Design a protein around this ligand. Sequence first.
Ligand SMILES: Cc1cc(NC(=O)c2cnn3cccnc23)n(-c2cccc(Cl)c2)n1
Length: 286
Amino acid sequence: QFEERHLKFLQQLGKGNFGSVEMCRYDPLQDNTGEVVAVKKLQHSTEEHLRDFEREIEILKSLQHDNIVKYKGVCYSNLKLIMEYLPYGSLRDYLQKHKERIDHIKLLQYTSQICKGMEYLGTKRYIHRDLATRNILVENENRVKIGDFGLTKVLPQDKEYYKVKEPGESPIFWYAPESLTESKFSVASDVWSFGVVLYELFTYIEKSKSPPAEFMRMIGNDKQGQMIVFHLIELLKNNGRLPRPDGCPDEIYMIMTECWNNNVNQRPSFRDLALRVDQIRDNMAG
Ligand SMILES: Cc1cc(NC(=O)c2cnn3cccnc23)n(-c2cccc(Cl)c2)n1
């Protein structure tokens, strides 16, 4: 539906996994009245990555929710995914730049919207596998959207988990234990990663407080490569956990820690997380 020749490059926005996203103007009348859109492409096209990308596109096309980035279409010559452009960029960058202006009530509004977008995903038996603030986008001051689905899988019909081990860089510092040890991904592992997203938000993305920096400090920074994952596994098994962020209330920390349960079946559901967060937001209005 979108023709290559009318897509004008404006800037690179970011890179992630094996994808790249650009700001472009789609201007088929060539009178500079077209809309700005976001365009996702493969950094390096292979046959493997293209088939994954096609599935990614079909996944996003299938999702319609206030807190999920909107699909607009595709562009063929090398496949490109065209999405709505959200002008405040990624939540990771936004939070960092505006920390002095974003309060806890606002972080909890973002948290609630993330939970609802995630509950909608589970409704379609989709496992996100990559929840992190870098993957959430800001539409305006009062609304975020889950903004990338690069690693998202559909559960098989007969199982509540999906086993996968991709080559490359895995975001191991957001992973549930059973994802690290067994390569199992489920709604419950997404709940684990949501807890890390919640941790991220309450750190306001202070660099020295990122999950990689805190876990690497807990493991020892002398560790390289293959030994990191092994020491991370042992840490989590021994109930090593990210600390409570500066300023975070106990009740918000308890949500995180409950998400970070080694027992996959004892982690809360996305519907219950939303309820609890919304109840805490309501208790801050009075
Ligand atoms: C620093 C950075 C900025 C962005 N994005 C955007 O500002 C953006 C705006 N509308 N929009 C739509 C869809 C996707 N992204 C956007 N990203 C990024 C986000 C997701 C995936 C990837 Cl690979 C990068 N990183």
